[PDB]
Structure 1
Amino acid sequence: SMIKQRTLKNIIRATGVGLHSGEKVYLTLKPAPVDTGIVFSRTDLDPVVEIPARAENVGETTMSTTLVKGDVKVDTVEHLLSAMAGLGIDNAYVELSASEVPIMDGSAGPFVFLIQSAGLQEQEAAKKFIRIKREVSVEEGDKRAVFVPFDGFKVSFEIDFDHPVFQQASVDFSSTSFVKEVSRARTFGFMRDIEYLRSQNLALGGSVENAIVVDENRVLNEDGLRYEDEFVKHKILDAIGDLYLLGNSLIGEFRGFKSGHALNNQLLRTLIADKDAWEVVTFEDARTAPISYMRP
């Protein structure tokens, strides 16, 4: 009845564009051995450069989560890391032909469909969990990010934009479906920012195909929103991706108050350093565990 590690049953290939780069990228997810973790490969480079998707390799947090090793980056990892967190994937190689993970439709939805179509493989090794034992809070200005002990996994988030088109949601993932209620929540941008962002080489691949485009009053996307609270649900999607840089699924609660990649990563570093606040645990019997995973 032991909760076991999971990899992919089959290879997944996808094609898309970097939100930021506007570059066409070829993506391949490969099964990986027990205790590998999630490892990105820049296969376009000779030799190939691999970066474990871990907090210590986070270099940039400016309008995406960026893994860095010397002069080499992988931009915008948080949506795919979100899908792999959501579906309980411990071990995978992520091959990219370019520096940015493809944006797809702007959500984790295409990533979860492609993975679940390929299926997952249970492996003969206990799944390791990070359990929160003490409260860990970081703040900078009016922003705030907290880990709280919780016998399960749950994410609360609040944003506070002053904009007509608005901002609080809480999700317990032993009670709520990641696939149905979170994975389809798209990234969003404001018309005002897109002009400025175009300048400082950003949003080069952005469109209504991969983002909720907002002017001063309205969503411009013809078909509108997938959820009434899509904006704050996408912040939760991002936080789940960032949390996974821990390298093991969490047993605790996350609370974001206007937090983002920068302050999320501040929290990860503080938590990792305060070893009184967390422990690695396994579950030899799934039936008594606080969390549970869909059939593989």
Structure 2
Amino acid sequence: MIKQRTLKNIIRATGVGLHSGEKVYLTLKPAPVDTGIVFSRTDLDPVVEIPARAENVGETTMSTTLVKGDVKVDTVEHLLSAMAGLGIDNAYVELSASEVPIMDGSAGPFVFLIQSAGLQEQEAAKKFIRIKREVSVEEGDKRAVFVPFDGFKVSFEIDFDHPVFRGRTQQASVDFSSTSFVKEVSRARTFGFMRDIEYLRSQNLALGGSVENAIVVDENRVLNEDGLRYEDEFVKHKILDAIGDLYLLGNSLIGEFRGFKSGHALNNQLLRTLIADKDAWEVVTFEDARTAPISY
């Protein structure tokens, strides 16, 4: 059977929150079968735990934020993308502050941490959510869709008209049958438009942002001197973001996500909308890994 996966060892890193600029200690720990990913604010007394599930996502302008009462864990999407990409079912994530460290702006550092902790197979069948019927949500010209697919595929299109984006692909469709999440998706850095980052900074936000953790573009050019890690790094980061947000379903997906100018809010709306309709999905396991449309 395809087994559930956790970490072999506890592993740690430090960084700063992108939004808050606050130094934060991060700890990844093994967890028992059927735990899922659970965040813990260990700085608080008592310690507050928030399961990484769609229903616990709050309403914020930027990034995916988990909430329980007045307690938050901000910017969970890149770490969760790495967890999803490596097929980690169960883990505890301890944080000393209200935001996951931004690291280099990609999922790469979290992939590195997870790999370094080691991968531990557990004695229980891994559960998958299979999309049975197409479900969609929209807001203006933004659209997010789950489509049935015998495998795992993430497609995304952005639609920027600014000169800096002219001629760029702005679209990608990744079938993970033949694409490596680690090598071809995980290192895509977050990005922002200079005018928008200026606005955030004027409000004392984006305090942790720097040339070391984000690609900055103005209307006409990429400002980062070194260029891009992938030729289509921008849309690849949107795909990274979607994979992280989708992991709030609590299980790996058998299906396709299609995003059109979508973001964290719409991604979460899609999850809640899918979850509510039991005719549109089912939970499956694989007693024979060879008969599975995916592999970790």
Residue identity (%): 100
SS at match of 1:147: strand
Q: CA deviation at 1:222?
A: 1.5
Q: CA deviation at 1:201?
A: 3.5
- Whole-Å separation in 2 of the counterparts to 1:210 and 1:220: 13
SS at match of 1:122: strand
- Whole-Å separation in 1 of the counterparts to 2:45 and 2:12: 21
Q: TM-score, normalised by structure 2?
A: 0.97
Q: CA deviation at 1:115?
A: 1.1
- Whole-Å separation in 2 of the counterparts to 1:236 and 1:4: 26
Corresponding residue of 1:237: 240
For the aligned residues, what is the CA RMSD?
Answer: 0.8
Q: CA deviation at 1:146?
A: 0.6
Q: CA deviation at 1:287?
A: 0.7
- Tell whether the 8 Å contact from 1:61 to 1:261 is kept in structure 2 after alignment: no
SS at match of 1:146: strand
1:110-169 per-position Cα deviation (integer Å, ceiling 9, x unaligned): 110121122110000000000000110111111111101100000000000111221000
- Whole-Å separation in 2 of the counterparts to 1:286 and 1:194: 46
Q: CA deviation at 1:60?
A: 2.6
- Whole-Å separation in 1 of the counterparts to 2:219 and 2:152: 36
Q: CA deviation at 1:93?
A: 0.3
Name structure 2 gaps, 5 residues minimum: none
Corresponding residue of 2:129: 130
- Tell whether the 8 Å contact from 1:207 to 1:213 is kept in structure 2 after alignment: no
Between the two proteins, the alignment pairs up a number of residues equal to: 292
SS at match of 1:15: strand
- Whole-Å separation in 1 of the counterparts to 2:204 and 2:130: 40
Corresponding residue of 1:66: 65
- Whole-Å separation in 2 of the counterparts to 1:80 and 1:236: 14
SS at match of 2:278: coil
- Whole-Å separation in 2 of the counterparts to 1:60 and 1:16: 24
- Whole-Å separation in 2 of the counterparts to 1:250 and 1:62: 26
Q: CA deviation at 1:200?
A: 3.0
Query: Would you identify which runs of 4 or more consecutive aligned residues in structure 1 move more than 4 Å?
Result: none
Q: TM-score, normalised by structure 1?
A: 0.97
SS at match of 2:138: strand
- Whole-Å separation in 1 of the counterparts to 2:45 and 2:202: 31
Moved more, 157-166 or 275-284: 157-166
Corresponding residue of 1:176: 179
- Whole-Å separation in 2 of the counterparts to 1:124 and 1:47: 32
Name structure 1 gaps, 5 residues minimum: none
